[PDB]
Enzyme design. Sequence first.
Site, PDB file in Angstrom:
ATOM      1  N   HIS A   1      -3.502   1.918  15.444  1.00 25.35           N
ATOM      2  CA  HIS A   1      -2.191   1.350  15.167  1.00 25.35           C
ATOM      3  C   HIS A   1      -1.213   1.903  16.194  1.00 25.35           C
TER       4      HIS A   1
ATOM      5  N   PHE B   1       0.487  10.030   2.564  1.00 25.95           N
ATOM      6  CA  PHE B   1      -0.167   9.430   3.721  1.00 25.95           C
ATOM      7  C   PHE B   1       0.626   8.285   4.324  1.00 25.95           C
TER       8      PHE B   1
ATOM      9  N   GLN C   1       3.102   1.164   3.268  1.00 28.78           N
ATOM     10  CA  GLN C   1       2.858  -0.033   4.053  1.00 28.78           C
ATOM     11  C   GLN C   1       3.267  -1.256   3.259  1.00 28.78           C
TER      12      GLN C   1
ATOM     13  N   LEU D   1      -4.906   7.406  12.354  1.00 27.79           N
ATOM     14  CA  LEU D   1      -4.411   6.092  12.747  1.00 27.79           C
ATOM     15  C   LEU D   1      -4.072   6.000  14.231  1.00 27.79           C
TER      16      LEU D   1
ATOM     17  N   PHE E   1       4.015  -0.412   8.635  1.00 31.94           N
ATOM     18  CA  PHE E   1       3.609   0.877   8.098  1.00 31.94           C
ATOM     19  C   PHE E   1       4.675   1.924   8.405  1.00 31.94           C
TER      20      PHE E   1
ATOM     21  N   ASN F   1      -3.185  -3.007  11.727  1.00 33.20           N
ATOM     22  CA  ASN F   1      -4.009  -4.190  11.904  1.00 33.20           C
ATOM     23  C   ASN F   1      -5.399  -3.947  11.346  1.00 33.20           C
TER      24      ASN F   1
ATOM     25  N   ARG G   1       0.826  -1.202   0.000  1.00 33.97           N
ATOM     26  CA  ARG G   1       0.000   0.000   0.000  1.00 33.97           C
ATOM     27  C   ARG G   1       0.861   1.254   0.000  1.00 33.97           C
TER      28      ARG G   1
END
Lengths: 299, 320, 205, 290, 34, 158, 55, 49, 34
Positions: F118, F52, F55, F114, F105, F94, F47
């Site tokens: 996370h 942003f 990941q 987040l 990440f 997660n 990702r």
Amino acid sequence: PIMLLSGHEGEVYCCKFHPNGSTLASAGFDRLILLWNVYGDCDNYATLKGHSGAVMELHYNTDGSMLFSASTDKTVAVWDSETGERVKRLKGHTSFVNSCYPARRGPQLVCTGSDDGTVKLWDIRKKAAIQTFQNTYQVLAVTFNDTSDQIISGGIDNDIKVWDLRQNKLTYTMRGHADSVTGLSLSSEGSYLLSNAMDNTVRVWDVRPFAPKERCVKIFQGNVHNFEKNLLRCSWSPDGSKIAAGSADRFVYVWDTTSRRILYKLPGHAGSINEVAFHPDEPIIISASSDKRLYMGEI
Amino acid sequence: TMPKPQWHPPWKLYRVISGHLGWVRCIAVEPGNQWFVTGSADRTIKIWDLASGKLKLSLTGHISTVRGVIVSTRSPYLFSCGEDKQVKCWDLEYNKVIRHYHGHLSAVYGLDLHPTIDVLVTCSRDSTARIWDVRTKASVHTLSGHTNAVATVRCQAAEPQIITGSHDTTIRLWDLVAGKTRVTLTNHKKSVRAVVLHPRHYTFASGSPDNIKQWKFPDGSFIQNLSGHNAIINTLTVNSDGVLVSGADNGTMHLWDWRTGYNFQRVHAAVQPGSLDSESGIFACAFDQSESRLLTAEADKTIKVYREDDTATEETHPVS
Amino acid sequence: EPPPYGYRKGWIPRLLEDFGDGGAFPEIHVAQYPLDMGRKKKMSNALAIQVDSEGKIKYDAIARQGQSKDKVIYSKYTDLVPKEVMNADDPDLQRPDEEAIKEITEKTRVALEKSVSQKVAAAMPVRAADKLAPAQYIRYTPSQQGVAFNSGAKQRVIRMVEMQKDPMEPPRFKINKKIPRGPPSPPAPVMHSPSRKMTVKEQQE
Amino acid sequence: WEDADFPILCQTCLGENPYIRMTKEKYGKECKICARPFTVFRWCPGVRMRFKKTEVCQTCSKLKNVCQTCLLDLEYGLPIQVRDAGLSFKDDMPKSDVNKEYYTQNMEREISNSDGTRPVGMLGKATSTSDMLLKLARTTPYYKRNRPHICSFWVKGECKRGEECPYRHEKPTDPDDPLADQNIKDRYYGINDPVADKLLKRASTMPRLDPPEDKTITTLYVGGLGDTITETDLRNHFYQFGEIRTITVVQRQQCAFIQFATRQAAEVAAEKSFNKLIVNGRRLNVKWGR
Amino acid sequence: QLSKQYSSRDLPSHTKIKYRQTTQDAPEEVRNRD
Amino acid sequence: WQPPNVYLETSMGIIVLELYWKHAPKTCKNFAELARRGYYNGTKFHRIIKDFMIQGGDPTGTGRGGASIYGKQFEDELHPDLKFTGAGILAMANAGPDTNGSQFFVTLAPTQWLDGKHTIFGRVCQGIGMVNRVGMVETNSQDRPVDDVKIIKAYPSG
Amino acid sequence: AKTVTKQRVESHFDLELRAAVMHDILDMMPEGIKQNKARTILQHLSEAWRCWKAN
Amino acid sequence: TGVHLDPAVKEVQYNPTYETMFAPEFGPENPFRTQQMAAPRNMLSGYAE
Amino acid sequence: RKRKRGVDYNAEIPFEKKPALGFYDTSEENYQAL
């Protein structure tokens, strides 16, 4: 492999194996019954003919020697897998006969569920009716009990009914399904019986000499209905290990008797799956769907 | 260096056929090995016997130079292609044209046949190739993308199925079904007029006045050079035993070893009596089906046949 | 440098010099921009300066401009060097086994001939017009799902039926329009051998 | 010629019933822009609504990312000019005959090499939906679009077809109105479409937070706070957006006053939050304090 | 953009491909021969 | 066993991330054991959200793989004051609490969203300009970007 | 793509002959690098032909 | 982890188990994508089957 | 006003090919007038 079969012109409603595990029978809207060989390339040898209405349920005998097939045109038919030819046209049904069941290991005897309001018992040799329990309404599925002395049926009023062949009264009525029941199949235990019903729940029951008086045993989630209200049918595995169901969701649902977990919601289909067939020998699955063809999954 | 090349015996001229009235531009051998066929710039197609060298028959349909002939292995057909922009199918049970493929916009320079399916591929000077359907005369694909005349085309059953060399100095490997170029090879500096595929090795070679190059299928990875023949190279032709014949346009012909690229003979033949010495040139060469004879079609209107020399040995003709 | 872990309280790092070797202070209630971090920049045209699986600068990109990865692009010096494949033996180079060839032939035959059939059925033009195929059913999931529209439902199923063609109807539209031909494909890199020199005398020749 | 699998249309224009029945016609009409023949799909929008038709090529659609008949954008749903402006795009599609046919040919050749999944070009490089675009967007289906036309007969009196008059037998709209004459070609090219100008003026008159005069006014007043918010919650609203220097949660007036550490950070935060910082459901009013 | 024009010479003709028969020279024999 | 700076020299640039065990002992130990374990070689960025997140670290490269050093996954080790307020906060994401596995990440900007889902477990002490470059790259519609950018070397601090 | 019939036999012969000549050397035996003058070698070709015809 | 399938891969020749077929993907969903760019799409405006 | 290809010169870039982009930012570049 996936092994998708085609050659049917309209929906296939019913697909089942030879009780040998040798040959394949499928049928549906096209008013004829196609046969295939399960092994090799899954190839087609024979086609049975004659039924004017839609073949709504085909049923084997327990050796595989004669074929029973319930038709929309008020009739059941028994044919010779030896030939494919008609021996008997069970007429006399006053409406749509949807469900048929030949007695297994007893005298040759048949129970047929129909849209007339009666369940009908017939002997193949006499060309006459044996018994008929007019409850009130349409009966959508029918199966014997391994004693060939009770007869179970499921219709629109949600209370699964069982008649004693000798006292001829409503022996056993069971309750708990929220909407119409669409399928019954008694496992090879002779005891555990499986019920699909489009209220989105499947149930398990057990016909015994003595049962807890409320024999709603196991319950699984997942089946679907929609504007189709197609007839949905279930089966046990040869072992009573996995329950297979179809639904109008294009997903073959394979669950287990033990942990009631979702072992599978398999995609692959295009139209509603109407009938799943388990191989009496192998881990072979055959899906009959309303997308005008079949699937041969191996698990 | 290299391991040392295999020893091949050298070749000697043993026959000179002369009956054409213009340059001889293409040559081919029948499947069953009884006759070969030549097409010439006098617009005829002559059919000669391969044992005797006698002329069997003369077919006259074209309007200009016949620049390619081929004989199909699956059907009794001979496909010819001319500078009149027309491509013909002669049926050899009546000796008459039965089919003609229309649509090229300038002279057709060469043509090949697919070995399994029934299609034709032709290359022309409008800088396109076309994939024709043998049976319905319909052009199923126009392979376009070159930027100058398409000198040569070869097709195969494996993949990629079509290799074209053109006069913009580029080679392209195409896919037959999709109909577009997978690979473009720009290693040559001058026009690529010759392409050949090894019979049993998934490799191919491409000839140009710079040097011959070898490439490796299916995406054309370079392998090695073959240098020494500094001449406009009109043909390449490979034996099954790894002999590679490079025929030039000033008449000189080199014979190479395919695997190591070692030029083991150089033939400089002589011009027919009434010819000028500026008129020596090789336009096509073809191995027999037994791969024993080597026929060449020349710019002095003769067909020269070479056979291998049987009385020479590694010590008579050593390998340098 | 950056204050110690647990003793980084009190200071709010505003210039990336306060990062020492770098780092964002998650406990510091400031947007940390350590070593050019945080700030959304202008959208620039420069395409992604990629780097190979060893840390080399993959200039294959600029020649491969706007092309698939099916394209094989020779653009490195190492493509010119003679590979030492003076071997009569290696099973690297031997044609595919004739079974795979049979597969390719069948597939090609299929696609080839079906396109043939359409192109020649054009040359029928007197089309022995067959019936219109049965009405198809297609199930459609809009992107704009929600209960604002679709009456709260998510999918809609639609019935495709193909409209009859009038037999006696001439063509409708002008076919012959001329335009210059499009741009070709991205020019491939010219992988030559280095040029040699022509003396004055040769150019005289 | 184009060839499609289905239309690509706004949910407004596709209809109301979940179950629609639609007809296809191969090579049925000529795109009013692409100028080439297309496949034309026709559906009955609803009960007593005009049959609508896809009116622009599938390529002429994928290029500018619009609905093949509704012509409005696909995600937000505003006129093409408005969406372009809100994405700050500069669409360079040619205008004259030969140049436009040539551009269409090559754009189509290049869109052949796509996946059929998302618009080609800057319409992927401009999907950063600005709050202006989201703010102008339509909310529920303006299904007044699909009612029939105005009956010239029933406007003159003549629609003697009883109740079946093929057009809405109501008053004809005054032709002076700017919202009357919007030719298809311009509405696709986005050059002087009146609805675009009216909607843009509406977006200019829409409330947005105002900026102060002095650089030293770095206290920002958020009005309408409520006592379900925490100082740490106001932080989390204005903490990672930059740095905040102080926070005064005025409980005697249900407001807040945030002193920041970066002027641009607080400006972006408050303007981006103007009446729309919806934390625990409170309409806070972001402004610069005294 | 397919035309409905047509040609006298694009009528169907020679619509079956002759294949080289058992004795003429089929690819089987030439596969065998010496 | 708390490796200070885990060096993950990606193809596209060098990296070494400092994990605060005092705030995040469980995920610091997990990530160190993974980096010294060398299982991260071959993990493609599953990702990339421009400005942003980056990941990656998935043994499938699709997002339905990944395992932890205590089995399949374990719980989160939350911090009260550690957040995603700035780039490079290394927090294993997660799809549901107490199920954080191998996936890694790296923030690229303030990610106060987040926070709480996370566990911010450190910050990347090497290669932040490279992080920005990887964050600028053009990605497909599934955040598996067109460039198969992978780590060359995965190892911890000495 | 019109065929070559009977009124275009000569004009076509000359089209293809001088296309061939231009392929032939003036681009494949050059190293008159700068501008290989092929438009002037074609003039020599036409004049050699007239000189043949005039003996 | 055991055998999972690539969710974007729809041509699946293996008989997948329940977890082996519908295993959820880990991570956050990209906040930059409108409803249109977020839904699963075969066509420009939606999947159609 | 009836000429098909005339304004193909003075109104628009006749057939516009915008330069390809490579490894550098061409965005901020802009040029003067006459």
